[PDB]
Design a protein around this nucleic acid. Structure first.
Length: 196
DNA sequence: AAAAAAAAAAAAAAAAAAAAAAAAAAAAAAAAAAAA
């Protein structure tokens, strides 16, 4: 696993679809068939902290694991680590990469990532701008895409209602960009008039 | 009974510095062009 993680550092390798797909499936088989859900998650966290272009790779790997390899525990642990992660006041690429990863994951698999959203909400208290915007955007996309399945709404009424109430309360903030993200999320929610 | 010498108004240029107008840095949204 280590040599492929080192080779993933350079950007042009990530752009090609075949190699990215092969690395995604090999990482999925490593996580599922051979366990070791601790080294791989730490490597992904290191790559996401030190690099910006690997957020989409992480989200796609998590989506592939959730769909075929039905192992949502890795995503739960990654989200918990993101919630408990601390950033310095000097670096800004780390929070931006985290934000991009959360946005892509919310675009990919709302349902798996919704389970740990209760601990993710605790990250909203951070003074970081991009992370707050990403949390708002992720909440909006999760509640918009989960709207299509009635079973998902029925089974998860309490937390989706809490998330919508928090989004409504987030209409006032020091950052205008967080307010803009909240308004965009509300627009995505109200794009359909069948329910709510 | 002119002639040096000291005291005193009058007057150039010179040095000074923090406060305000103006310009650059950083993150994000919108518009146009290229690749699939």
């Amino acid at each position: 696993t280590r040599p492929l993680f080192v080779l993933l550092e350079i950007e042009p390798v990530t752009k090609v679809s075949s190699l990215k797909m092969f690395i995604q499936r090999i990482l999925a088989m490593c996580v599922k068939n051979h366990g070791q859900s601790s080294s791989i998650q730490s490597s992904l966290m290191t790559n996401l902290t030190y690099f910006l272009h690997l957020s989409v790779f992480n989200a796609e790997l998590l989506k592939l694991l959730n769909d075929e390899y039905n192992y949502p525990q890795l995503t739960e642990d990654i989200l918990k680590e993101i919630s408990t992660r601390v950033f310095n006041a000097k670096d800004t690429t780390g929070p931006k990469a985290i934000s991009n990863f959360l946005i892509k994951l919310s675009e990919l698999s709302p349902g798996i990532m919704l389970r740990q959203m209760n601990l993710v909400i605790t990250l909203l208290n951070n003074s970081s701008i991009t992370l707050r915007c990403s949390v708002v955007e992720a909440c909006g996309n999760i509640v918009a895409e989960l709207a299509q399945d009635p079973q998902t709404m029925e089974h998860y009424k309490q937390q989706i209602a809490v998330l919508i109430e928090l989004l409504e309360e987030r209409f006032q903030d020091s950052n205008p960009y967080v307010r803009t993200k909240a308004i965009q999320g509300c627009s995505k929610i109200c794009d359909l008039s069948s329910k709510f």
